[PDB]
Structures are given as structure tokens and as C-alpha cells.
């Protein structure tokens, strides 16, 4: 992309990430009082649709929204809860190249021996003494 549109992407991403930075900085160290006494109103033009019955007197509405003066000394209102993680967004198709043509030689070439430990036995198994002495290379070592 050209320098103009790289710079436009930089400004948009910087705006969004700066918003998240500011929210995170308020999370990690909040101001000692969570009071914002510079409360400015927010006026909203509200034109309703049809509703449960009919209309009576006036439709259009002018709404003044102000934040509520919360007690500086109040702790958090509600206990946080442990909820399991949601299901993932639906997976995509598995766009694989056609599967490898294996042979029985390859399946035999990738057989993993059952492991017989010289030290461990967490199920208390009785192993034949042939198999216990199978991976002991000391007897099959060379002496000369």
C-alpha cells in the first residue's frame, strides 16, 4: 500500500489501540475516587415506531441523559462469576492437498514399541522378564 493509505491505517489503528490503552490504564490503576463531577448532559432526539397499542399525545421526544452521582465510597456492586468459555466461531473447511498414499511398509515403519521401564510401574504390572531385559543394552555391549 502507498504511503497515504499506510498512514491512514496507522491513524485508525492508533486511535483504536489508544482507546484500549486508556481503558487498560484505568483498569490497572484507577483514580482514587471514581467520581466525574463534570457531568455534561446528552440530548437525544427520539422518534418512536409503532408499539403495543396506539399513540396518544406526542411521538417525538427530547431526552436528557446524565450520569448518576455515585457514592465515592461504594465498593464494586456485584461479585464476579466463573463462567466456562464459549464455543468457537464456526470452523472453516479443511483445504488439504490430496492425502498421501501410504503403504503397509510405512505403517510398520512408524510403529512405536510399548515402553517397559527399568524404574517405573505406576499400574503395578507384572512384566515378563524377557521384556524387562529387552532394552538393556549392557548385556549386548562389546568387550575387547
Amino acid at each position: 500500500p502507498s504511503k497515504e493509505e499506510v498512514e491512514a491505517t496507522a491513524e485508525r489503528t492508533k486511535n483504536a489501540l489508544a482507546a484500549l490503552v486508556s481503558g487498560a490504564l484505568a483498569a490497572q490503576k484507577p483514580k482514587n475516587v471514581q467520581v466525574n463531577t463534570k457531568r455534561e448532559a446528552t440530548f437525544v432526539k427520539y422518534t418512536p415506531s409503532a408499539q403495543m397499542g396506539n399513540n396518544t399525545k406526542k411521538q417525538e421526544r427530547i431526552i436528557k441523559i446524565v450520569e448518576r452521582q455515585r457514592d465515592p465510597m461504594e465498593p464494586p456492586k456485584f461479585k464476579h462469576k466463573k463462567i466456562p468459555r464459549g464455543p468457537p466461531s464456526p470452523p472453516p473447511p479443511v483445504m488439504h492437498s490430496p492425502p498421501r498414499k501410504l503403504t503397509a511398509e510405512d505403517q510398520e515403519a512408524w510403529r512405536i514399541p510399548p515402553p517397559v521401564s527399568m524404574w517405573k510401574n505406576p499400574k503395578g504390572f507384572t512384566i515378563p522378564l524377557d521384556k524387562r531385559l529387552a532394552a538393556d543394552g549392557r548385556q549386548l555391549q562389546e568387550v575387547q
Partner: peptide, 18 residues
């Protein structure tokens, strides 16, 4: 264990000193 998104809750706890 898999990573989680952060909690979208009200801030009272202090975690990272600047």
C-alpha cells in the same frame, strides 16, 4: 491452558503500578 480475553468489568482492583 488457553489464553483468555480480559474481563470487561468495573475497575476497583489495582494491578500494575505505573
Amino acid at each position: 491452558a488457553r489464553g483468555k480475553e480480559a474481563l470487561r468489568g468495573p475497575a476497583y482492583h489495582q494491578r500494575l503500578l505505573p
